[PDB]
Design a protein around this ligand. Structure first.
Ligand code: NA
Length: 209
């Protein structure tokens, strides 16, 4: 079904997205808490846009059960950034990198077109990715950079008690979405584009490191 097709269709762009120099250096302990903070600032920008798009598509009544508000990350990230930066200064300072501008532009287009299939593709890449692999990154930020666990709220889903079951039921929801061939093809293409945007985010973050 769709969950399997998504993995197959996106394999090349996904593989490339997981092999950025920025993330390699970050996870091996070669950077610092500052670079982790820059990553989270850029993520706050695109999660904010993503969640506006999710809100629009949810309100239209498309894929409602999938679009669980308990997954919302923007406010959690803001709280992490408050702690990481030590003040609210970051809200006035931070601005989107060129990749994030493109990523946000696309998410805003999806919002305005209330494009359900394309939104689901973005939801998969971010949230199922976060559910699947967030605890590895969190552990590495503590091990390498001494990040306070209270400043890693992004990597914990308070609303979710059974994580393994949740991920299974998430994939099953994907499998059970009613999609025409046009909608399915649109979604699959969008998923590759989403991995690409994310790769480019890392590329920008790694400049001058
Ligand atoms: Na699972």
């Amino acid at each position: 079904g769709l969950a399997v097709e998504l993995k197959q269709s996106t394999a090349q762009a996904h593989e490339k997205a997981e092999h950025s120099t920025f993330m390699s250096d970050l996870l091996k302990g070669r950077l610092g808490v500052a670079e982790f903070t820059r990553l989270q600032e850029q993520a706050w920008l695109f999660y904010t846009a993503l969640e506006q798009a999710v809100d629009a598509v949810r309100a239209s009544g498309f894929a409602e059960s999938l679009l669980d508000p308990a997954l919302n990350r923007a406010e959690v990230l803001a709280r992490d950034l408050d702690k990481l930066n030590g003040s609210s200064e970051w809200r006035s300072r931070i601005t989107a990198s060129p990749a994030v501008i493109d990523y946000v532009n696309r998410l805003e287009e999806i919002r305005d077109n209330v494009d359900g299939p394309a939104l689901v593709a973005h939801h998969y890449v971010r949230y199922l990715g976060d559910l699947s692999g967030g605890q590895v990154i969190a552990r590495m930020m503590q091990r390498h950079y001494g990040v306070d666990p209270e400043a890693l709220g992004f990597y914990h889903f308070e609303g979710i008690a059974k994580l393994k079951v949740y991920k299974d039921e998430y994939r099953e929801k994907l499998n059970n979405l009613e999609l025409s061939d046009e909608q399915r093809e649109h979604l699959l293409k969008e998923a590759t584009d989403a991995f690409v945007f994310n790769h480019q985010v890392f590329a920008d973050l790694g400049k001058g490191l």
